[model samples]
Target chain A: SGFRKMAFPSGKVEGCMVQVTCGTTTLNGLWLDDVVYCPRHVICTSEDMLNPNYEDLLIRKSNHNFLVQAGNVQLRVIGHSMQNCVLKLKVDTANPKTPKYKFVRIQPGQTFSVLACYNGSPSGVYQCAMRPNFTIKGSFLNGSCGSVGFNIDYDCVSFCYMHHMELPTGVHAGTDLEGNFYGPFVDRQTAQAAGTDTTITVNVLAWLYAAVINGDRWFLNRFTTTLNDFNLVAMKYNYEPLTQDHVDILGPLSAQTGIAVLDMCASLKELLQNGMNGRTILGSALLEDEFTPFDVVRQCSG
Target chain B: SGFRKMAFPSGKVEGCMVQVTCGTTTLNGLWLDDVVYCPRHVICTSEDMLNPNYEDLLIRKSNHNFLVQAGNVQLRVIGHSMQNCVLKLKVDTANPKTPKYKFVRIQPGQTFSVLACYNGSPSGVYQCAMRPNFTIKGSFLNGSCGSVGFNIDYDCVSFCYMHHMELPTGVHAGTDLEGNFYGPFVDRQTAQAAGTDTTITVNVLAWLYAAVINGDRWFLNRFTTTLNDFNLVAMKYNYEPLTQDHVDILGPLSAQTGIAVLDMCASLKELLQNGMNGRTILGSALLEDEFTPFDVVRQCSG
Candidate 1:
């Protein structure tokens, strides 16, 4: 079943909890007030599992914590047959999300309950879903891709991903930027790997999702004003209103007129400072007051 | 509801039919012996409602028309409030596909029961699901952006798009590619736009969908042998075995290698031949036998 229902383990809470029960596989949790809760990556109300840091801030910030867990999944890539390690995981029979819940990428270096199989693809770009605390580490894929991954690769989203869209993220419904599982909260390094050459590109829209729309409650609420301030600067600098094209395909109004990076981050302040190489964001670097939507979907993080 | 149950309308037929029913929208259709049938774009068996050309070949060739409609959908982007023309459509409560079933992109250029609304975005890139006969004309944004398109842009896929993946298309389930509504059957010209720089880039994986997996039965069935022949040449010249990285992340064995476009179509001979200028595929032009998965997810196609 898709989004299965669950009750608060604490006292009688007003709202219930829903996790993306992908495929036929399948949770428990705490609560407060009439708030609904979900996994850490999603911005559900007052408190959530997975991310334990941000609690009070979420409760204080009105309805800022508004994302639903959407669903949860547990994937295990087993080579039942030694032909090829076909990755298999069940998806929500009821609810689905971009990159489905629990779905993640695992590199060979991670050393999982890892096992050997036959005929490997280069890089072993194997992606699968997991329950929290499963001790799996690899990048999370943005778009959907259950069937194709079984047949070929894991770069493309599935038809379900194509249809089930328009989540709580500000990045809209149909675009590639929204609904992505790749966030700053988890797999914390890849999105920040600007110095590395293999880094996939991302843009302002995705930055908005990571910083404002989806991520740690503390990180999200704290950066709200900073984002609004940044937006003011970006829109003002480009001499254009935040219209559809300005945010999507046509690109930013200012083009390469040069916007400097704003330093508000404490965790990756130094790591991010290297990205500010003066003027425009150098390649994979993100810039303040810059929401260019270029190459956003090329790697799934518009 | 998603994929609703259906039976053959014809006399005592032995098969079944399914459609994309995106959101809450909904379908009727025909069928044939012991095989499954679906919408035109998906490669179903025997006779189907949408594409009427290749009935016997699918029956004769064993199981080429293997794709399921997954589900059917109908979209109508109506702005109940004039603040902005927010589109709305229904999706599957059950089976889903890339771009959901009826999820297709529409352009403002084609006259629909077009109406004027509040502040419009640049290009007005609106998307919605549709029934077969409804008049809709617009470019399809590949990535899932139901929420973004409703809120900002449709360039990105939704959270649902992120989670629900691994479709019938050759491309994998995680990348931005796969599960797109934009195909050769509906908005015929956009994908073939070699003359226009606005043409979105696609790669070998998508061509397979259009030719073998999801497209006109006549075109797909016709192009089967041609694609297999091309793969042979590509593998022979590369001097490498098919591995995960070779098919996905790492890229093709031969970098920027020269490969001539094979001629098979009497219809788009000139249009495709123009793409074979010199050695490599020009920007925005697809190459023969080259399944390089570049820019596959950027535009929602592989």
Candidate 2:
């Protein structure tokens, strides 16, 4: 939320440590154990020393387009120097349309290079953001081809999500699973009265196979519109774990294993939980195979 | 939102019509077209129908365990009567749940098929509200094979959408050459934005190549989020009078030969209209080689 610091793990270059401050435009710190060159450093934050919000202020120099300031803030970038490179105090948060000038860019006198920005400024914590912009090239037009990386400092908001969470909630078991399967319920009486033909076969088979093979028959008895989602995600996601034929499918297809009949329900539960993400209560089944015939009901909701 | 009769271009098999409903009670219509064959056809609109909702009801005359609604509805065979074919009602809506069904076994003794009721009279739509508890065998249990070609009566929905007068609006355009493009936007800005992206350097090249090779650029561009949606849709939907190969990429990289430019803000009017979705628009300009530089400045008063 506030300004953080920046650092150069390693690089070779030297120039005046220029600072720039665009209102609410903060920079992040850098940390790279592996690097090629080392250089001088500069840190810029979103604060003001002579604190005041100058709505229309343009601090420009020959080398850089704006001036960087330092203070008790959330983000600031550290960088050495180079020619044909310009820096500004730009806004880089959830709101991309807001204008600021801290972003560094390369002129037409171009070549591929790295414009590193570290997320550290005298040991301070920066919050994880609203959500990551999956895009990797928002600034490609403003500058030519060069490397760009941000040192987001929030541990819970940044690192926890980046590394730990790989699945969603409510996905208990199944392959390719994520998120809770929500739905419109369809009872047996309605189905039979309507005379659902071959679909009944499929519905039965899905639960039978789910129960017999994976052991989750709850879907068959008390039908929900969300069953389609669970089936799709599980069917596609589970194909790999079920099919040991590695050569048949390429890439990540071989990453998982198929569900056995006995553990099907368990796997389904896991997948459901995964899909629902943190909201398990919303997706947890009230009864396992309550609607399925006695013969076809699964043994476990595991 | 209510029931509407729909008819499509001729393709439906005579005597094979299914009278479908999205309600949660008894399957009412008795003509051959009224049979719900797929679980998708199983409809339960509200909790008012069932205590727990989601029940599809159908009566099996041959079951003998229950009285048949004799003469209420008759099934006629076109050829050598089908001795072992199953029947059911089907819905074509996009539901997220695993499909469900109820089935009724027919005995071999009955020469004619009729909705076995309490008497020889037709009951009201909701007369069979109570589930005529019965068992059934279904064929559509697995998703391995696709079903027979029975399209939804979407014509009604389409008509409603077309005549709904008060809807969001947008611009529209057609492909230069023959090809399918989906639109008739709610407004003009949407159409223009899509056009701008379609004509971008990368998008144009990709689209041209797809058309030249007669490849599946429509699926690639429209389906995959690899390129921006506007560009992707353009590549797949629109066609230039002439197309070039990968070798001709150099020609369309920039706007000149009467083609649109990849540069930002090629036209000020278009730029103002195509404001960033959901984001506040500060100002836009052409940055020398940077597509849109800072030539014009605009601000919002709100």
Candidate 3:
């Protein structure tokens, strides 16, 4: 049989009692940092049980008969809540009357985790400890922190999958969780057409993600400046801005203006042309200095 | 002297009116397109022109004094709601003319691009023709169309420049309207990264434009599916359908699965191996089978 345990700080305030559920009955206790586990519980920090790459682990149907992996497992148990917080393990299916934990009384800043143990079975069910004087705010803290040689297969697998092909060039995680994986990822199409996913970097994925979510508000705002520059450049090149009323929609602030972001870039070129003594910008002044000013979004609105 | 003219078939509509204004009261109705040159006139598309990627063309300050090349040029005015429409342009700097050519009717099924004459000097005061028919029983309309093209340049130097290294690759329009003679209009980033414009094709742009307007529920619903394929392919691997919650979101039927729209591609091997192949499917069966259900938005409400 597999056993599970959850560690919690047993703290009680007033007459509120902390509680944990076991079988048909519930256990009442009051203790802080109390570690609780079932007999057959397997340590999640075990090598075979870990997947470091949080985004890569996928527990499928094959996992229906045994303990499976979670891409990014965040296990929690109810400690105490003003209103009852029903904590149930969502497995292949929900199970009732299984070994469960609940906390009724908790102090502020306390944390705990709810673990489930199965009798070597594919399915399992467990509940969180419930408490009433739950004015305390606690986090679902990690249970595998004390040992030095604990396995981190979970973290390793997740990280490897996320930063997999990226490992060759550079991939490192910091204590702050802000890491860079800069090598490569699978780009089958490019591997066929352009030669390799080596052209892609983990940074690109991050940036791509940002672009996908915030492109309109921030990343694409640069387009406003770019289009203005194009218009100005086209104007200088003897090309004309079409007289259509629609063209007026972009307004003068955009690249349609006789200015370009590249021009701002050129001032450095000019400084360079004058000789890179101080990196002379070879381009025009930034639009901010331009006399007539307009809002990109607002002007573009029309 | 430059000229401006607008005409409509007849009658009044809600927000479909076209109005023009020149910087000065003393203006001439030389040619319709030339009116966009007026310093004072700030012409905006139909009231809702601010939506992204639809018609965000901006007319810059430098565009105000563009030296007109002496010639008979054509200016194209493309708008979305102008089906069998009319235009109303005039010298409305202040108490302008009673507005001649008040109603030049646009033919039905014909796109909106009238060839008005501009003989250089550059006039001002222009607006679109308004429509009066408030509502019809049933008619489909949209706020976008293919790109609008206008070639009014005769003899002049317009300096166009690249604003950003990229342009909106998908569903984009082009114009003679650039400040500099620049751009093959390539979206440098994606073209370099994705290696093809097809990734950002007309369909993708349309999808994005729809998302921007918030009026495109169907378009967006489909886009998620289109991206699903991309996500799956990029992350290569599998998950069990019956045991995991991920598959639940996709629903039963492919037609019903909104992800179908965003799933660009699915490998043959993967689809055949895991998907329900040649399985008997029915609404009744869907109740018993996880793979047969679909969600209809029309029949659903929050």
Candidate 4:
């Protein structure tokens, strides 16, 4: 499944560019750009050089940290420059057992700064300098800051990525619509088989309504699991009937619409009660008919 | 290399959870977390449930998308609620061939909106629905907005990541210190070996200083490809004698400091000129100087 095939566009292909994406890496070059150029003393065919053995060389170099050279040309080099750095310590209170390490790339003559935080507060022992790596000489041993920020004298173009250690708070994070987070709803078979009561929220009702109006086949399949069990006797009474209010609220446009919502809900409730469904009903009392329960609430409030 | 050993911490092992990271996927819970309880019809020795053939079941169930019921209990079920969703489209101008598809997790009753941009203009044909997957009923068409922005009545949480299509621009992007981009500099050997003259930037100078000051073995080894040829007669000061200014700028605290930097650079230049001994000259330079290059810049500037 992971393997993909590649084919070239039809044309006079000597000078056109071609690119291939394999896994996460991309290799691109002019079709015949280096087709004939070969380094001296290397005994390989032009095809070998044309389709460079980039993957094997890169994997071997990265995995083994070995030096590779052909004649004077270095092959399979570590492409990233940032990895070519190391940090040195210069503080009296620095812990040898759990010393902090931080790295940021910098341009020449740039001022570099690093801050350390512990237990939601700054350690107060930080350094700033006119260069990066071990060349930092500026030290501020006493300060109280929870976070560290730095600026320098030279232009330092850098990319930063922050990986948070904490999981999503269920509220503050995720893609927001309206104000609530969109969670996947339960499938019908799973619901019918659930031994515990499954709570169907108001948002779920909205989804049901939308599914009905749009004729979504996947959404409709959830109900078919229970619908298939209906017999003539059960169908004759339309499953305990529906209230006028239920009809009014569910289908303002048509009486049939109102009956459909109530009938579906009643059948769903039966499945929930008999442990034929996973969703446990959370609330009692028919919800207010005038209110539309489909709108989402803000993430901050809920 | 892919195989890993698992060890348990001292405890009554039956009630704890065991988790493993295999490749990109994580498997968690069930050396037995919900212990002392078993579903109907499943009988096993502690070892059977303890190391359940979870990988096979999970891979099979996910790949086939089928029901797996043993006795009354479902095996390897998809626990996510949103997997039940289907996308619904609204708006008059929707393209039948290339419909939009997006997903984000949200809480119940939240408004969900997805924004899309096209060709320097806003595509007003967008849908915001309460339930995900083929249930959308809200469609706003014919709005002349340059870009579509959506807000819902609910909360949604989402995370995003960006990958650059190409290496950062040498001047605009890279690991930035302050504002400038510090780029991967061309090595002396590479420049000499090339048919063209390569200009070295100040950022490259900073990288060289950082590489030297940090004693980065990897960075130094890259240069060593050329540094291997050190014959003293040829010692022939391939150790190119330095200009007075170069000596003065590099050393001030001690006459040896100036000579050291000069000597290292000269030897490097020679190796770069003719393939020679790489490590031999690396050790000759007196590496320890109480002063750092960062402080020297200040000393020079001040």
Candidate 5:
């Protein structure tokens, strides 16, 4: 029902500007780039709607409020009974068959919104649902946690009643989201400290994907070097190299709406075990180099 | 004064057998292999004098006595007053310029002997002297910590009275001395464990040398792999690859008797310092990979 084509009169040439007025909302200076590129997609690109100063963008609401409007991003639940409802926004869905979802928790009568470059779009429908306890998922959609967008309304039945809907960030692709997002994505001091043992791997892998996808060379070089260090440790313990296949897997994403970095936790579990069990008595002795004065497996497994 | 020509009558062909007898210590089946090969050196290689069971050879003296006698390897003090004296024996001097020396501790009325393959000949004079605490020098003469012959008699003071010396093993190379005097040389488990902030590098390096000189392949391979791991860690901390030079240095030992593995403790001190100080916001993020759950300098420095 949300996929109906727009009814615009007349034709627009490639790269030519046109105004599509639909009721009160209008998409001005819209380029007729392709038949598939509709005016609804172009409406999100307007500078008047998108914030230019993306740095430290904050979205906040009192515990008693529900309506949220922050720059180009907005969230609202449409229903006869929309009260005391919690919500979550999922920004990426690389696998249509089994899309990995992310969640966020919102209290009743509370609304939130913030915007930055995310996934493959500057503006698009971010899949969301009415939910509570969303903070349990450490892999937040595009690094969004409590600070992004959320909304809730009053309900008599449940303390944390729920509603479902998708939010829209009114902007288009081809705009630089890195200027706004990269700083926070790479800003890991607080995040690293906050990470638990269970979540550190996913958190790190997500950061790696973000850095690589955005073509952040400095981060890529350093990240690859660290992986190499792990490989060296593996070799000593007779474990197979972990990062050997990473280069091939990262090169392309054919026809996908998004990409979710594969979680290496299970692989690493296998690796650490295999590595520890594979070590020889003699092998352990040789690992006593001046630079590595500690037990190889013991030092590395952690 | 130590290098004098052996007095022999008549002619001897190259690689031909010769009997050179000097009193009770006769060197039968001696070969006049070259102008440099002498009868005194040959006497150390007799089957009658050298033990046939060099495997797991034992050199022991009763707690109450100070007389030591073995097959080929023997020790006698030159002077009258040699008592309760500590002695060091240097067997191989590959670097004539800086002949490496080794030491042994002996108490009054204590004698010791054992043998294994070492040095240029099956037998030879191992340089000796009296001294206190021989731990000052780390690089002993070509793994000659034990398998060499020596004598000690005092020119100064008194004795309980005692004579101390290090003797030789018959095999040329590629044998472990851990059973004989090499036990003390290799008895570095406590020494290695005692190493804290100052001595870790040297302890590891000395172990490497002992492993190499004894041709302990099991230890060598593992040790090299561990060194590589350190280099990898350094790379993660933005330090340049450190052990890239190790292979070339370890290849040739003709020019020097011992290459005291450089004190990487100092280099590592700087590396860890520079590494900790050099950490960037981005560097920290990359280092969060699952394969490297622990910090490099944080783990190694400990």
Candidate 6:
């Protein structure tokens, strides 16, 4: 932004300004009266810049690296500064039948820290996300640490999903030399004939979970071949949805609450308007890609 | 590609072939002898394809869904079909002074299953990553299961990385209103000065780890501000490296063994000619990007 004069409610000016350009990157902002803001897409995160009481707060001379410029107007506001911290969103159980939210703070830097999202709790339990039905706990890796308080800024969002495949009749199942199968199989209805030549499309989130995410080829081997048999089933998620527990499958960000389930289709519509992350995963875990009959809790290992 | 004639050493042609498109995918092929091949970019995985002795192993009539047609020759070979399995590569330490290799197969689908990559072991230990010296165990998700055996096919590869920065003086330590810092800092040698206004470019892998991946903004907060003191740190990963432990960071796939370091530089060089997948993570972890004095083991927890 060109220039502007603003003051914090406290009315202090010295060491009260910080400037930054926030374009594609995230976590660039300050808190004014408990709200966060990013000026010109810039990550103006300085504990000192909180509760703004300055004019044209420029990037300090030494911290020039934070001053990446994009085309936007720099704006000022009254707020607090953000450091490396996290939002632990949960549901307020005062009314068990209705949905309410509660938030806590934690050092996202600590690997054990997680952002749990619960649409409906097991009494008071929670879950994490990419689907509204999914309720699991996920963790994010982007945070900071220091003695006085968390320093700097940045944020991410992500979700969990399910790989739901329908097995209908007339779609005669097919198999290969390995007895593994493939199919265009049946359409949503049973009218379509199933065969090795049949097919359909799926979401990227679903497909990857079946292959790259869980390495479930054996699960895939039964495609058109075993429609006569067992069940088969299967996203960018905030904080990577990286978990070491069995918590994901559907629901809201333990943040983005009160939104519709398919808000994703809309967000993606806006994502036709947006942004991205990464993390490590180990141990037995599950995501939104599974079946009602599938035992994910025991799926981690034999 | 059109169909072709080939055979396995067994000379038995019954149930001996599987067909798939050989396009932009990670794992899709049969294993003939000890080698893996993704012909026509297709995932021709059928345990039956293994040790073949047949001709024109066409896509079985039943598996019509696997018949994704791309313009390539459909050839047959003497190979074994692949199910959802894994390749574990390790250095054979028959000789501690020199390096040899070892391979093992495991159910990659099991969440606890890991592909441990070791360069030089703790007397036989190893490391992980996008960097050379990494020695860690990584895991992946992408396999299948069946009543008789494993099914399906597909594969992927990825690496770890390190976030390295040189904070030189003229790049005087900088800080913001929050005492958080930023910097263009210093160049390789002592000549160039770093500042809030300066920044040398960096690899996307490194930058994201600090921001989107690890959320170490506090580490970032001290940019120009704490250079006189501390250290700072942080990619695609195959099977998501999604570790729940402190492993990652600078070695080889426990399959991509015997390659040189910076092979990534060349591969990325070829990626100028290439393609690409995801997972979850939890617990404390460390990656290849660290300083010699940086005690990563302790960094995982506490």
lDDT of 1 at B178: 25
What DockQ do the predictions score, one after another?
0.01, 0.01, 0.01, 0.01, 0.00, 0.01
Docking class of 1: incorrect
In candidate 4, which residue ranges exceed 4 Å CA deviation?
A1-203, A217-247, A253-259, A266-302, B1-302
Model 5 alpha-carbon drift over 4 Å, by segment: A1-302, B1-70, B73-80, B87-197, B200-302
Over A1-302, each residue of candidate 3 has an lDDT whose tens digit, in order, gives 00011111111110111232323222221112222111111211233232322222212112122222221221133222111111112333122212122322221111222111111110111112111121111111112111000001111201100001111211111110012211222211122111121111111112222222222212222323243554454444333332223234222433433433343223322322342231111011111110012112211212
Error of 3 at A136 (Å): 64
Per residue, candidate 2 scores C-alpha lDDT tens digits across B1-302 of 00001111111111222222233222222222222232221232343222312222232112222111213333332211111121332222222221221123221110111111111121100000000111011111111111221111321111100000111111112110011112332211121222232122332232222222221122111121222433443445332122233124424322322223222212212322342232211111110110110000000000
Candidate 5 CAPRI level: incorrect
Candidate chain B TM-scores, in order: 0.18, 0.20, 0.20, 0.19, 0.18, 0.18
**Residue-level lDDT tens digits of model 2 in A94-128:** 22211121222211111111132222122101111
Residue B44 in model 3: lDDT: 31
TM-scores of chain A across candidates:
0.17, 0.20, 0.19, 0.19, 0.18, 0.18
Per-residue lDDT, model 4, residue A155, is 20
Worst 10 residues of 3 chain A by lDDT: A157-166
Higher-lDDT candidate of 1 and 2: 1
Between candidates 3 and 6, the one scoring higher on TM-score is 6
Question: TM-score for each prediction?
Answer: 0.20, 0.17, 0.15, 0.16, 0.16, 0.21
lDDT of each prediction vs. the true structure? Answer: 0.22, 0.20, 0.20, 0.23, 0.22, 0.20
**Candidate 6: residue B233 lDDT (0-100):** 15
Per model, how many backbone clashes are there? 94, 152, 140, 74, 18, 154
TM-score of 3: 0.15
- Give lDDT tens digits, candidate 1, residues B37-125: 22222222223423433333223322211212322332222111100111111222322222212222432111111110111111111
Model 4: per-residue Cα lDDT over B198-253, one tens digit each = 21211122223433432333323322212233323223532322334443454532
